[PDB]
């Protein structure tokens, strides 16, 4: 699939934080309505150390089906800093964007999108780039406040940033602990909770797109 290169990767982590907050300008947080017809989870891995693994996998909906499978190997060269994800991940999740023949109509990461000390988390960030609705899928929080939901199953808060929505926290699965859900480029809250909440069996914490990516980077270790 073809992307925009919207700036370079090598920055030191100044300059790539002087970035995220020029393009969180370009963020556009439009609902996403009806259903969708493929459906995205992307997922990365760090096997041993200096080897790098993205995948991406294409799932028909609603039925989870498997159409496609891609996965890029590749060196690592920006340390993990909270808030500066893309930085790290981002070109060797473009190189497997790259070999995508199946066109998706959403894609949702692992992380966050708006819930994001700038606005610009990697499910954001990387919508800007493929230019496809996103959402990022987190297991814990990065930023914002909210009130933790009820047990049950498909309780769930808002995410906050002082008085505005950025999220919310789903209990997708009863004595777990929650999914952090948060819009990333055309999507906007509620369509995000909508969405992940259809992605997600009963009985499950994590949605099938990332569930499935997370199982293929486990299995195609070199
Ligand atoms: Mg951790
Ligand atoms: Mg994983």
Same mark, same amino acid.
């Given at each position: ?12 982590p100044?300059e790539?934080?002087?970035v ?8 556009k ?13 992307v997922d ?14 294409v799932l028909?909906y609603?039925?989870?089906?498997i159409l496609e499978?891609? =996965?890029?190997? $590749? ?6 800093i909270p !808030?500066?994800?893309?930085? +790290?991940?981002?070109?060797? #999740? ?7 023949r ?8 692992d ?6 000390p700038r606005?610009?988390?990697?499910? =954001?960030h990387? $919508? ?7 959402i !990022?899928?987190?297991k814990? +929080?990065?930023?914002?406040t #909210? ?12 995410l906050?940033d ?6 919310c ?9 929650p ?14 909770? +909508?969405?992940?909440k259809? #992605? ?12 499935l ?5 486990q299995?195609?270790?070199?």
């Amino acid at each position: 699939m073809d992307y925009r290169q919207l700036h370079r990767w090598d920055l030191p982590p100044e300059e790539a934080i002087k970035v995220q907050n020029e393009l969180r300008k370009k963020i556009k947080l439009t609902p996403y309505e009806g259903e969708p017809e493929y459906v995205a989870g992307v997922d990365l891995s760090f096997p041993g150390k200096e080897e790098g693994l993205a995948v991406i996998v294409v799932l028909e909906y609603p039925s989870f089906k498997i159409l496609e499978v891609v =996965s890029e190997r $590749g060196e690592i060269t920006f340390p993990y800093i909270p !808030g500066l994800l893309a930085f +790290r991940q981002g070109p060797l #999740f473009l190189k497997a964007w790259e070999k995508l023949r199946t066109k998706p109509d959403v894609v949702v990461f692992d992380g966050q999108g708006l819930a994001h000390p700038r606005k610009l988390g990697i499910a =954001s960030h990387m $919508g800007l780039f493929i230019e496809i609705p996103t959402i !990022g899928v987190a297991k814990s +929080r990065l930023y914002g406040t #909210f009130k933790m939901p009820e047990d049950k199953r498909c309780s769930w808060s808002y995410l906050y940033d002082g008085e505005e929505i950025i999220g919310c926290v789903i209990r997708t699965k009863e004595g777990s602990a929650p999914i952090f859900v948060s819009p990333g480029h055309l999507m906007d809250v509620e369509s995000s909770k +909508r969405l992940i909440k259809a #992605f997600t069996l009963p009985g499950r914490r994590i949605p099938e797109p990332t569930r499935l990516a997370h199982i293929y980077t486990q299995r195609l270790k070199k």
